[PDB]
Amino acid sequence: RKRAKV
Amino acid sequence: NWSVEDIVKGINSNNLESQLQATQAARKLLSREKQPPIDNIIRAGLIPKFVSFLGKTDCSPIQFESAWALTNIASGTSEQTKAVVDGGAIPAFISLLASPHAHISEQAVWALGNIAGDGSAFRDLVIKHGAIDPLLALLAVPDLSTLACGYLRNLTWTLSNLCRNKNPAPPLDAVEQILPTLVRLLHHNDPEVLADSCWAISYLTDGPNERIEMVVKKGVVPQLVKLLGATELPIVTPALRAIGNIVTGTDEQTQKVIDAGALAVFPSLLTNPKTNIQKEATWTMSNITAGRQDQIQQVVNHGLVPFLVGVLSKADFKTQKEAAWAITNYTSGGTVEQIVYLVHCGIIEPLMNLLSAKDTKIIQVILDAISNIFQAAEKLGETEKLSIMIEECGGLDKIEALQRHENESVYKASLNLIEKYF
Ligand SMILES: [Cl-]
Numbered sequence A: 001r002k003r004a005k006v
Numbered sequence B: 001n002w003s004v005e006d007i008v009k010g011i012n013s014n015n016l017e018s019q020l021q022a023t024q025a026a027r028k029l030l031s032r033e034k035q036p037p038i039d040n041i042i043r044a045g046l047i048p049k050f051v052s053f054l055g056k057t058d059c060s061p062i063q064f065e066s067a068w069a070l071t072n073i074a075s076g077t078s079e080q081t082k083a084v085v086d087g088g089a090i091p092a093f094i095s096l097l098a099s100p101h102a103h104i105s106e107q108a109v110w111a112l113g114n115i116a117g118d119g120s121a122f123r124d125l126v127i128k129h130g131a132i133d134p135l136l137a138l139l140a141v142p143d144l145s146t147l148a149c150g151y152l153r154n155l156t157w158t159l160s161n162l163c164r165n166k167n168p169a170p171p172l173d174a175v176e177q178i179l180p181t182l183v184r185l186l187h188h189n190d191p192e193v194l195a196d197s198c199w200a201i202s203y204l205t206d207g208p209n210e211r212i213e214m215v216v217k218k219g220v221v222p223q224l225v226k227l228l229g230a231t232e233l234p235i236v237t238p239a240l241r242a243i244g245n246i247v248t249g250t251d252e253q254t255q256k257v258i259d260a261g262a263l264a265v266f267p268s269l270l271t272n273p274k275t276n277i278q279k280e281a282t283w284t285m286s287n288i289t290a291g292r293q294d295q296i297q298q299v300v301n302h303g304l305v306p307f308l309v310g311v312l313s314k315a316d317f318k319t320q321k322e323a324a325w326a327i328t329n330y331t332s333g334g335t336v337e338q339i340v341y342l343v344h345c346g347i348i349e350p351l352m353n354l355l356s357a358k359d360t361k362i363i364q365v366i367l368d369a370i371s372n373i374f375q376a377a378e379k380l381g382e383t384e385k386l387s388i389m390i391e392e393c394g395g396l397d398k399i400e401a402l403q404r405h406e407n408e409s410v411y412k413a414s415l416n417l418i419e420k421y422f
Helices: B004-012 B018-030 B039-044 B046-056 B060-074 B079-085 B089-096 B102-116 B122-130 B133-138 B149-164 B171-185 B191-204 B209-218 B221-228 B233-246 B251-259 B260-268 B275-288 B293-301 B305-313 B319-331 B336-344 B346-356 B360-380 B383-392 B395-403 B408-421
Strands: none
Touching: B004 B018, B004 B039, B004 B046, B018 B039, B018 B046, B018 B060, B018 B221, B018 B275, B039 B046, B039 B260, B046 B060, B046 B079, B046 B089, B046 B191, B060 B079, B060 B102, B060 B251, B079 B102, B079 B122, B079 B149, B089 B102, B102 B122, B102 B149, B122 B149, B133 B149, B133 B171, B149 B191, B171 B209, B191 B209, B191 B221, B209 B233, B209 B251, B209 B383, B221 B251, B221 B260, B233 B251, B233 B260, B233 B275, B233 B408, B251 B260, B251 B275, B251 B293, B260 B275, B260 B360, B275 B293, B275 B305, B275 B319, B293 B319, B293 B336, B305 B319, B305 B346, B319 B336, B319 B346, B336 B360, B346 B360, B346 B383, B346 B395, B360 B383, B360 B395, B360 B408, B383 B395, B383 B408, B395 B408
16 A cells, blocks of 8 residues: 555 | 754755755665654654755755655655645645656655555545646556556556545546556556556455446456466456456346356466465355356356365365355355256265354355255255265264254254254
């Protein structure tokens, strides 16, 4: 549902 | 690796370049620590400043750094996402979708996906701010293959979040506006685009029959069946979910799945080594056996009854429960011949062996099947030779022991069968 840019 | 107060000092300076270095330092905090200090960033009051940097078209670098930083804040808790939305980020990100810098436009796509992914309320608020038009325009190209792979994947994922969630479902007009692009993405030859495209379809078909009809009318069922046979598990899972959703609708909708060739894939799905695939494949089957008698006959013709006997005989219990449903719907709507055939495939023994589970719901399901099986025998005048079958496999010992069961309808149907056939 949500994704962080790492 | 700046401290939050150092970042604050830079962003509060009256120097855009000092603001840029501080904003970048924040971005690196939020993208490189395993547990980023999102809340400390929020508390310092940096979100409004980041949002204001989104609008500095004269400094594309600080646009990117702020967009990245806000993307990672928005990927956290609903309260952290809300802080981004509360800072006015939605309209600012939608205006960045038109940026000539592809990496900035992509970052705005990403950020909007996280916001929309929070829930139906923020999903619909992103839509109300007018995100769909500029998003779909990014894909208005003759060939999707000319777009960067990572760019296209992020767009597909964000679009699937606009299709996601219920109570309520997305606005009907928004769904109609997106579907044509989804269908086009469903034919793109990238595994990740295909997976998220299938997920989007599965969300749109998880609802009442009118929603299913919107999707089926687009003619995507044959493509979903094709992806149902893919070798990539991340594709089969959402494809199977979508197919299973479609067969919860009308018999006419279920027939389009059958006409597309879906049943030919279920030999592998019903023996798939991934437990979830097997369970969802058996759930799909339970909704096909609840259809018309000519659809029950296609299940027979494709040789799937032995596979139902196999799952009923050995599988994860959740899967066996779905198979029990499949058999009850089969026997309720099936012809006498079709019920006889079911017995000749060996349904009884595994059916009886499952009458000793710690689940009241499945026992009831099983007992209704036995009744509808005995009913078919009464119509053929051989309730006897069936009673013996249930006896020889130890089925009568269970049903006898169920008359003395602490539940409503267990001993009800149990007593009934015992004293009418035994
Ligand atoms: Cl036989």
